[PDB]
């Protein structure tokens, strides 16, 4: 199947004496696998998935040195941006980066990503050609010209087509068992008189992994598309997730309605109803 | 392994 790797990096400047805080998080198939945080007593890249314990001390030492470089890069970049936008000192500012690759099951690079945001707004991005830049505003035009003049895109292209792909392959090989694990939802329906002769039926799904899930309500064999309220899928805090979906129905008709739960972990979708 | 950025912004 398809696979992805991403590194999500954040530098945040602080008005006081302190240098910017720098955090980098690595993900494989959307699962956090390494993290570096300049605020730790011993800042270093740390494994965040059990399958990363295979890497030797030199992996961690050299990645840590890389992070240290990135941290200086972001400090300089933040200073430059403050000048581009004519911002006053003694504020706080956020620079973010996302980088990585999506691969097919034949290990072909499908797309490479390299993009930045400043103050939560898109700043500059490497286009899908891995050769040209899209710059969002006036300041980013300065950065784009600078990067075109130094031939920056070819270094990012080499990373995205080379190292990104090859390391992703290594990680997927090492983390195979673990990355395929699933926990199935347990589901049940609750009944809540809100009223004017109406009831809310709420269909709960609990304890499931990964977070991807679909809950639907139906009446007489049609899904209820518009009428249904949802909550965003939320972490239980033990590694599993939770979600619910509810419909408003007439009192006396509750038994007509069925909730369905679709999840990768299940041998088939669940189907359930208010059981008084 | 992580990207190593080149020229600063």
């Amino acid at each position: 199947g398809p696979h992805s790797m991403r590194y999500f990096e954040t530098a945040v400047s602080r008005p006081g004496l302190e240098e910017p805080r720098y955090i980098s998080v690595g993900y494989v198939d959307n699962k956090e696998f390494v993290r570096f945080d300049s605020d730790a007593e011993n800042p270093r890249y740390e494994p965040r998935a059990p399958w990363m314990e295979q890497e030797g001390p030199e992996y961690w030492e050299r990645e840590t040195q890389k992070a240290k470089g990135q941290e200086q890069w972001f400090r300089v970049s933040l200073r430059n941006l403050l000048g581009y936008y004519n911002q006053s000192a003694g504020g706080s500012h956020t620079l973010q980066q996302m980088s990585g690759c999506d691969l097919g099951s034949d290990w072909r690079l499908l797309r490479g990503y390299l993009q930045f945001a400043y103050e939560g707004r898109d700043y500059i991005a490497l286009n899908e050609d891995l050769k040209t830049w899209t710059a969002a505003d006036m300041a980013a035009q300065i950065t784009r010209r600078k990067w075109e003049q130094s031939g920056a895109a070819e270094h990012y292209k080499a990373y995205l087509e080379g190292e990104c792909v090859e390391w992703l392959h290594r990680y997927l090989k090492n983390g195979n068992a673990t990355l395929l694990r699933t926990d199935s939802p347990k589901a049940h329906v609750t009944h809540h008189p809100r009223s004017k002769g109406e009831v809310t039926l709420r269909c709960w799904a609990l304890g499931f992994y990964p977070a991807d899930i679909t809950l639907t309500w139906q009446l007489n064999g049609e899904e209820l598309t518009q009428d249904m309220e949802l909550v965003e899928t939320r972490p239980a805090g033990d590694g599993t997730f939770q979600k619910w979906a509810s419909v408003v129905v007439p009192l006396g008709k509750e038994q007509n309605y069925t909730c369905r739960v679709y999840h990768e972990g299940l041998p088939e979708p669940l189907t359930l109803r208010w059981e008084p | 392994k992580a990207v190593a950025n080149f020229a600063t912004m």
Partner: T-cell receptor, first 110, second 112 residues
Framework: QQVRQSPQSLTVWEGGTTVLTCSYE??????FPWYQQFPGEGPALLISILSVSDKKEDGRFTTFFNKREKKLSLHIIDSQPGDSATYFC??????????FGAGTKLTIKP | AVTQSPRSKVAVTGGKVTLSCHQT?????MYWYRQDTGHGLRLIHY???????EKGDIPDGYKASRPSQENFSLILELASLSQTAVYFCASSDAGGRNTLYFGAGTRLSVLE
């Protein structure tokens, strides 16, 4: 040490092709710049190549990279008196600090 | 530009020597290298920000100072004979793969 550059000096006849070579130890190195230094001046970047490529050409200068043998080379065709200089190969990985070779002193004589 | 001062220095053994470098590249990284009879660029010290410095490969006998973004000095508190060499300053953006821009060198002779 990590970048081995030999010999210390080399003379090639004017018009001939100069071949300079270096080897490296760390197989993860992936950026390879050559610096050229004239007498009484500092080194200046001549040509560079990433490990994704086999060669890079710029005028009479070509650098070749061979990952399998961990060898870098610089070729100068139609070698001229103005090419007389010290050539440094260098290598690094990622954003780590550059490692320079010891330099080869080139003299083009008629 | 990266410009070093002085161009040449003759000093007594045990005497104090300061080599200066001024860069107008708006670069953040600065470096001091040693070259010996035309060979090597061996890193002595470097710096990535005003007010601090970092040891290079061969820091023994030398100190470094970074009093501003533009200036980076190399200090020999007690010059020895063995420090007779040519010294080159450089700057770069953010180090790593960023091109190094060098000064034209300072020749130092240390004599009894």
């Amino acid at each position: 040490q990590q970048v081995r550059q030999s010999p210390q000096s080399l003379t090639v006849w004017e018009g001939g092709t100069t071949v300079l070579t270096c080897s490296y130890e760390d197989s993860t190195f992936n950026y390879f710049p050559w610096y050229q230094q004239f007498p009484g001046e500092g080194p200046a970047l001549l040509i560079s190549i990433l490990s994704v490529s086999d060669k890079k050409e710029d005028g009479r200068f070509t650098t070749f990279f061979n990952k399998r043998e961990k060898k870098l080379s610089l070729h100068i065709i139609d070698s001229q008196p103005g090419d007389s200089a010290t050539y440094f190969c260098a290598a690094l990985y990622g954003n780590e600090k550059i490692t320079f070779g010891a330099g080869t002193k080139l003299t083009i004589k008629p | 530009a990266v410009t070093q001062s002085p161009r040449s220095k003759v000093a007594v053994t045990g005497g104090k020597v300061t080599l200066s470098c001024h860069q107008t590249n708006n670069h953040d990284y600065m470096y001091w290298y040693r070259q010996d009879t035309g060979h090597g660029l061996r890193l002595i010290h470097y710096s990535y920000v005003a007010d601090s410095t970092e040891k290079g490969d061969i820091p023994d006998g030398y100190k470094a100072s970074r009093p501003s973004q533009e200036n980076f000095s190399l200090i020999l508190e007690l010059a020895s004979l063995s420090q007779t060499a040519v010294y080159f300053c450089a700057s770069s953006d953010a180090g790593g793969r960023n091109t190094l821009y060098f000064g034209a060198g300072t020749r130092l002779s240390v004599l009894e």
